[PDB]
Design an enzyme around this catalytic site. Structure first.
Site, PDB file in Angstrom:
ATOM      1  N   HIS B  42       0.642  -1.182  -0.030  1.00 53.88           N
ATOM      2  CA  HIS B  42      -0.037   0.006  -0.099  1.00 53.88           C
ATOM      3  C   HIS B  42       0.852   1.186   0.028  1.00 53.88           C
ATOM      4  O   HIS B  42       0.394   2.266  -0.441  1.00 53.88           O
ATOM      5  CB  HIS B  42      -1.194  -0.091   1.034  1.00 53.88           C
ATOM      6  CG  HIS B  42      -0.430   0.331   2.504  1.00 53.88           C
ATOM      7  ND1 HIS B  42      -0.001  -0.728   3.494  1.00 53.88           N
ATOM      8  CD2 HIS B  42      -0.158   1.261   3.228  1.00 53.88           C
ATOM      9  CE1 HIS B  42       0.442  -0.077   4.392  1.00 53.88           C
ATOM     10  NE2 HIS B  42       0.478   1.031   4.417  1.00 53.88           N
ATOM     11  N   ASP B  88      -0.252  -7.399   1.431  1.00 58.60           N
ATOM     12  CA  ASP B  88       0.230  -6.036   1.472  1.00 58.60           C
ATOM     13  C   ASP B  88       1.877  -6.181   1.835  1.00 58.60           C
ATOM     14  O   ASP B  88       2.275  -6.026   2.837  1.00 58.60           O
ATOM     15  CB  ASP B  88      -0.469  -5.542   2.737  1.00 58.60           C
ATOM     16  CG  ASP B  88      -0.023  -3.989   2.465  1.00 58.60           C
ATOM     17  OD1 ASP B  88       0.533  -3.431   1.513  1.00 58.60           O
ATOM     18  OD2 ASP B  88      -0.498  -3.192   3.578  1.00 58.60           O
ATOM     19  N   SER B 185       3.502   2.444   8.570  1.00 60.63           N
ATOM     20  CA  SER B 185       3.288   1.402   7.829  1.00 60.63           C
ATOM     21  C   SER B 185       4.447   1.102   6.745  1.00 60.63           C
ATOM     22  O   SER B 185       4.968   2.101   6.210  1.00 60.63           O
ATOM     23  CB  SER B 185       1.868   1.494   7.017  1.00 60.63           C
ATOM     24  OG  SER B 185       1.728   2.500   6.483  1.00 60.63           O
ATOM     25  N   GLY B 186       4.497   0.050   6.508  1.00 60.02           N
ATOM     26  CA  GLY B 186       5.649  -0.424   5.517  1.00 60.02           C
ATOM     27  C   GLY B 186       6.734  -0.978   6.221  1.00 60.02           C
ATOM     28  O   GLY B 186       7.894  -1.798   6.102  1.00 60.02           O
TER      29      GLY B 186
HETATM   30  O1  LIG Z   1      -6.919   3.967   6.153  1.00 58.71           O
HETATM   31  C1  LIG Z   1      -6.418   3.763   7.340  1.00 58.71           C
HETATM   32  C2  LIG Z   1      -6.235   5.344   7.981  1.00 58.71           C
HETATM   33  N1  LIG Z   1      -5.420   5.059   9.208  1.00 58.71           N
HETATM   34  C3  LIG Z   1      -4.107   4.327   9.208  1.00 58.71           C
HETATM   35  C4  LIG Z   1      -3.415   4.823  10.394  1.00 58.71           C
HETATM   36  N2  LIG Z   1      -3.442   3.694  11.315  1.00 58.71           N
HETATM   37  C5  LIG Z   1      -2.011   2.962  10.931  1.00 58.71           C
HETATM   38  O2  LIG Z   1      -1.419   2.947   9.956  1.00 58.71           O
HETATM   39  C6  LIG Z   1      -1.978   1.502  11.767  1.00 58.71           C
HETATM   40  C7  LIG Z   1      -2.236   1.327  13.229  1.00 58.71           C
HETATM   41  C8  LIG Z   1      -1.656   0.145  13.903  1.00 58.71           C
HETATM   42  C9  LIG Z   1      -1.013  -0.244  12.630  1.00 58.71           C
HETATM   43 CL1  LIG Z   1      -0.035  -1.753  12.770  1.00 58.71          CL
HETATM   44  S1  LIG Z   1      -0.812   0.420  11.215  1.00 58.71           S
HETATM   45  C10 LIG Z   1      -4.603   5.680  11.314  1.00 58.71           C
HETATM   46  C11 LIG Z   1      -5.374   6.169  10.062  1.00 58.71           C
HETATM   47  C12 LIG Z   1      -4.983   7.343   9.583  1.00 58.71           C
HETATM   48  O3  LIG Z   1      -6.009   7.798   8.400  1.00 58.71           O
HETATM   49  N3  LIG Z   1      -6.388   2.841   8.053  1.00 58.71           N
HETATM   50  C13 LIG Z   1      -7.111   1.752   7.517  1.00 58.71           C
HETATM   51  C14 LIG Z   1      -8.294   0.870   7.806  1.00 58.71           C
HETATM   52  C15 LIG Z   1      -8.591  -0.227   7.366  1.00 58.71           C
HETATM   53  C16 LIG Z   1      -8.195  -0.869   6.098  1.00 58.71           C
HETATM   54  N4  LIG Z   1      -8.535  -1.802   5.502  1.00 58.71           N
HETATM   55  C17 LIG Z   1      -8.358  -3.243   6.034  1.00 58.71           C
HETATM   56  C18 LIG Z   1      -8.990  -4.097   5.484  1.00 58.71           C
HETATM   57  C19 LIG Z   1      -9.746  -3.989   4.165  1.00 58.71           C
HETATM   58  C20 LIG Z   1      -9.914  -2.682   3.769  1.00 58.71           C
HETATM   59  C21 LIG Z   1      -9.508  -1.778   4.429  1.00 58.71           C
HETATM   60  O4  LIG Z   1      -9.598  -0.496   4.034  1.00 58.71           O
HETATM   61  C22 LIG Z   1      -6.866   0.067   5.461  1.00 58.71           C
HETATM   62  C23 LIG Z   1      -6.359   1.085   6.327  1.00 58.71           C
HETATM   63  F1  LIG Z   1      -5.192   1.720   6.048  1.00 58.71           F
END
Ligand SMILES: O=C(CN1C[C@H](NC(=O)c2ccc(Cl)s2)C[C@H]1CO)Nc1ccc(-n2ccccc2=O)cc1F
Ligand SMILES: [Ca+2]
Ligand SMILES: [Cl-]
Ligand code: NA
Lengths: 43, 234
Positions: B42, B88, B185-186
């Protein structure tokens, strides 16, 4: 392999990741270079 | 990283930082070898063009050990899709080899069957990165790490709004305010076995950060050990 076969890394027959050799004992792993994988670095 | 603490010198040497054309970090990665970085698929959707920085611990000061590398080839898992966030994973081949040094050294790839039986069964793993220190807040200028407990797959499924696949595992805390966050992430999830740290996960996604009743979701690296192997050899 269920105290990990007394192995320092992989498992009776021990082995090690890239950048290591199994020691004479056949359980420990010896790094071949200064920066072997998976070790925190020392100054 | 929400909670946890700063990596000390040499403590998180496998950390890599993907940087956009603004020279800002937007994703982590894991050093696998002098030429290869492991990251999340991603992450490839964000900056059209990015580079990799290794050895950095404080993004506000240029300190010895920092180096920048251009990416030669991006190998993104063919099956990744944002519909599911499944598969991913990506590997980056750098144009020039990383010189290992203080704060720059790869994490170990475990053998699959042994990883499954021996690492994935450990109580905790360690996650690190430069991401936000609170859900809505700013990215950390300092490299942080956080010990995160492995979380039972079924407890995780019950907690999650989305499907947890075999290529994912959950880690972190129900209510305690510690977790990875946006920008992490990553990046690496590694598990210490005895004296060695083996890469076990890729920071993948979460519903917010450190939310009550939600966990951190990681790509399960054991599922892709052959894929990583093939990707590094092509
Ligand atoms: O899109 C966000 C946005 N998130 C990412 C940040 N959180 C994190 O990156 C993590 C927390 C714990 C870890 Cl490990 S990575 C906090 C908000 C900021 O906007 N989070 C998600 C949620 C859900 C998903 N997701 C899961 C399965 C199927 C579809 C789908 O969309 C992706 C996602 F990036
Ligand atoms: Ca710096
Ligand atoms: Cl979200
Ligand atoms: Na939580």
């Amino acid at each position: 392999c269920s105290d990990n076969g007394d192995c320092d890394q992989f498992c009776v027959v021990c082995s090690c990741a890239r950048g290591y050799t199994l020691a004479d004992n056949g359980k420990a792993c010896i790094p071949t270079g200064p920066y072997p994988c998976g070790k925190q670095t020392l100054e | 990283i929400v909670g946890g603490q700063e990596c000390k010198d040499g403590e998180c040497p496998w950390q890599a930082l993907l940087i956009n054309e603004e020279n800002e970090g937007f994703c982590g990665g894991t050093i696998l070898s002098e030429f290869y970085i492991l990251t999340a698929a991603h992450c490839l959707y964000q900056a059209k063009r990015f580079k990799v920085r290794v050895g950095d611990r404080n993004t506000e000061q240029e300190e010895g050990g920092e180096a920048v590398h251009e990416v030669e080839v991006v190998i993104k898992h063919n099956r990744f899709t944002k519909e599911t966030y499944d598969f991913d994973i990506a590997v980056l081949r750098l144009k020039t080899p990383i010189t290992f040094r203080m704060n720059v050294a790869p994490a170990c790839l475990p053998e699959r069957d042994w990883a499954e039986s021996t690492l994935m069964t450990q109580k905790t793993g360690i996650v690190s990165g430069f991401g936000r220190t609170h859900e809505k807040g700013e990215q950390s200028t300092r490299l942080k790490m956080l010990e995160v407990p492995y979380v039972d797959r079924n407890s995780c499924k019950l907690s999650s709004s989305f499907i947890i696949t075999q290529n994912m595992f959950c880690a972190g805390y129900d209510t305690k305010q510690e977790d990875a966050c946006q920008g992490d992430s990553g990046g690496p999830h590694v598990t210490r076995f005895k004296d060695t740290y083996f890469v076990t996960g890729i920071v993948s996604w979460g519903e917010g950060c450190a939310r009550k009743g939600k966990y951190g979701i990681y790509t399960k690296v054991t599922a892709f050990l052959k894929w990583i192997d093939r990707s590094m050899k092509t």
